[PDB]
Amino acid sequence: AMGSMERASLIQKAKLAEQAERYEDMAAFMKGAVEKGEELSCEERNLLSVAYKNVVGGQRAAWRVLSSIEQKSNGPEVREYREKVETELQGVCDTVLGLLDSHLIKEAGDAESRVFYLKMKGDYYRYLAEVATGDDKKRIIDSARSAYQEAMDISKKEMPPTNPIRLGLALNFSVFHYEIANSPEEAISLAKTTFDEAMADLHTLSEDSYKDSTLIMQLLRDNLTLWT
Amino acid sequence: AMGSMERASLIQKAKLAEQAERYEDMAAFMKGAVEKGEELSCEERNLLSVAYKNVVGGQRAAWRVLSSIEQKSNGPEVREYREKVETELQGVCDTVLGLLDSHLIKEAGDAESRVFYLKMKGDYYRYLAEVATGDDKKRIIDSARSAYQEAMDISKKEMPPTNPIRLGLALNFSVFHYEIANSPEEAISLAKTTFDEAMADLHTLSEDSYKDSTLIMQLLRDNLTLWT
Numbered sequence: 001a002m003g004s005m006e007r008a009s010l011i012q013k014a015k016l017a018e019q020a021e022r023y024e025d026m027a028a029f030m031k032g033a034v035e036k037g038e039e040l041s042c043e044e045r046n047l048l049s050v051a052y053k054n055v056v057g058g059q060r061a062a063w064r065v066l067s068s069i070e071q072k073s074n075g076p077e078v079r080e081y082r083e084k085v086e087t088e089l090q091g092v093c094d095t096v097l098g099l100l101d102s103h104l105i106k107e108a109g110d111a112e113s114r115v116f117y118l119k120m121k122g123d124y125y126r127y128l129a130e131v132a133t134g135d136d137k138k139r140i141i142d143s144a145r146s147a148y149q150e151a152m153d154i155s156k157k158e159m160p161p162t163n164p165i166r167l168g169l170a171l172n173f174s175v176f177h178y179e180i181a182n183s184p185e186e187a188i189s190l191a192k193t194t195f196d197e198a199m200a201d202l203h204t205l206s207e208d209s210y211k212d213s214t215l216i217m218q219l220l221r222d223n224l225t226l227w228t
Numbered sequence: 229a230m231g232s233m234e235r236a237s238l239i240q241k242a243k244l245a246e247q248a249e250r251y252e253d254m255a256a257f258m259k260g261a262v263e264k265g266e267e268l269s270c271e272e273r274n275l276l277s278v279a280y281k282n283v284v285g286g287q288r289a290a291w292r293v294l295s296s297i298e299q300k301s302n303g304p305e306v307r308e309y310r311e312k313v314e315t316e317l318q319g320v321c322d323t324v325l326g327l328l329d330s331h332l333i334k335e336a337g338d339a340e341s342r343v344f345y346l347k348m349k350g351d352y353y354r355y356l357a358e359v360a361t362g363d364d365k366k367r368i369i370d371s372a373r374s375a376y377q378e379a380m381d382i383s384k385k386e387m388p389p390t391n392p393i394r395l396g397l398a399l400n401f402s403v404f405h406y407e408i409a410n411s412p413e414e415a416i417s418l419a420k421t422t423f424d425e426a427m428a429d430l431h432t433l434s435e436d437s438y439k440d441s442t443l444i445m446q447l448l449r450d451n452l453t454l455w456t
């Protein structure tokens with residue numbers, strides 16, 4: 001599909017699609033850059049993340065609208081279209097999890113790197129878990145949990161509490177606890193702990209993370225305001 | 229593609245896609261409802277219009293970003309991607325113009341109806357004209373002009389000056405004069421005339437057009453504030 005194009009061209013074009021708000025294309029350019037076989041740099045990791053976040057984020061919004069419209073209070077058309085979109089959402093999720101398993105997630109790699117791709121693995125299993133049901137759902141919840149946890153375990157050892165990759169992970173794992181794992185108990189603990197341990201060792205905050213991590217701190221709190 | 233589905237189902241689903249903001253799908257459902265062969269009702273005409281407006285509106289925004297990025301002040305990747313998107317934009321435009329020619333535009337029909345589909349024909353030739361160049365562009369400009377004019381000619385005879393279909397037409401034809409036909413002379417005339425002839429016979433304003441047509445009056449003025 002993209003295999004005739006040089007890796008550098010695919011990356012340039014991925015950057016152009018972010019500016020033009022073409023995230024179906026951006027993701028496609030980044031799927032192709034991953035498949036050139038080389039390890040992604042820090043900037044490239046984000047580019048991949050943003051592309052697929054928007055694609056899958058738009059589908060989830062659509063699914064939630066349509067799923068909300070299945071009232072069943074007091075014809076087939078609503079379910080059919082919800083399923084069409086649901087099926088589409090899953091394909092995109094399965095697509096990212098493929099690239100993560102077959103190319104990006106490796107045992108031997110940087111701490112920043114390994115956590116970033118594991119957080120992502122938990123995110124995309126989380127998105128699948130929202131749409132899944134029955135016996136099939138339990139499996140998907142535990143793969144999400146498992147990937148988030150290994151990511152947490154590493155970040156506590158290898159990263160300071162003001163690190164955006166660590167903070168954004170904790171944010172998303174709390175969201176998993178509340179919306180997916182039905183434990184506002186655990187969700188609140190992890191959120192406040194993350195917020196407080198960050199404020200406790202705020203001296204570790206650095207010039208390069210200042211913007212990214214103060215934003216995730218706000219998000220972390222907005223959630224606790226919303227829950228408590 | 230959609231040919232197994234009942235017309236009523238396609239319409240229901242088109243309405244569901246507007247709510248879920250899936251205008252690629254909405255347009256596809258409406259392309260299919262048009263191809264059932266039957267004349268579209270007033271509500272259906274809008275549904276079709278909105279679907280394709282958003283699809284083609286998103287592509288134009290992308291094209292204008294990418295085309296703006298061709299600086300050429302003082303590699304091939306920007307042009308290639310602009311062309312990819314340009315080619316895509318044109319296919320969607322050619323697609324609507326097909327449905328208009330082969331199904332919707334008829335000699336024998338309602339005044340409201342005939343004008344609505346001609347306005348649309350001028351709109352989609354306008355979108356093509358923005359991306360086109362050279363000898364090829366002149367043709368596209370004159371087809372836009374020709375369709376807008378026949379639409380104008382009919383609306384002056386058959387519709388009051390407060391009518392939203394008449395007002396929105398005039399709005400778009402002025403926009404054609406300014407951005408496409410390079411005549412801020414004519415664009416300003418038609419705009420103020422539309423605004424003033426509406427205010428002159430404001431007694432004709434009716435309960436059903438009040439919202440739609442006061443909005444187009446604002447748009448008409450915002451444009452004149454912007455031009456003069």
Ligand SMILES: O=P(O)(O)Oc1c2c(c(OP(=O)(O)O)c3c1[C@H]1C[C@@H]3c3cc4c(cc31)[C@H]1C[C@@H]4c3ccccc31)[C@H]1C[C@@H]2c2cc3c(cc21)[C@H]1C[C@@H]3c2ccccc21
Pocket residue numbers: 207208209210211212214215
């Ligand atoms: O070290 P950088 O990666 O260049 O960080 C800066 C950025 C940006 C900067 O703005 P600039 O276009 O004027 O250069 C800045 C930085 C550094 C330098 C300037 C800036 C300004 C500020 C801070 C860091 C930076 C601290 C103090 C002030 C600030 C406001 C809000 C949160 C954190 C901060 C852009 C680009 C980048 C950035 C990030 C964000 C945002 C905007 C930017 C939006 C979305 C996210 C964000 C978080 C919190 C509030 C608002 C945002």
Ligand SMILES: O=P(O)(O)Oc1c2c(c(OP(=O)(O)O)c3c1[C@H]1C[C@@H]3c3cc4c(cc31)[C@H]1C[C@@H]4c3ccccc31)[C@H]1C[C@@H]2c2cc3c(cc21)[C@H]1C[C@@H]3c2ccccc21
Pocket residue numbers: 435436437438439440442443
């Ligand atoms: O006769 P309707 O088709 O039911 O018109 C109303 C509408 C709506 C109405 O609001 P509602 O949700 O409270 O029922 C109304 C109408 C009729 C009845 C109510 C309304 C209120 C008003 C008018 C007409 C209507 C005149 C006086 C007041 C108004 C404000 C701005 C412009 C024109 C008006 C919704 C649905 C529809 C509507 C249309 C618009 C909008 C919103 C609506 C947005 C986008 C466009 C618009 C134009 C100008 C300003 C704002 C808008």
Ligand SMILES: [Cl-]
Pocket residue numbers: 080081084241
């Ligand atoms: Cl469907």
Ligand SMILES: [Cl-]
Pocket residue numbers: 013308309312
């Ligand atoms: Cl391209």
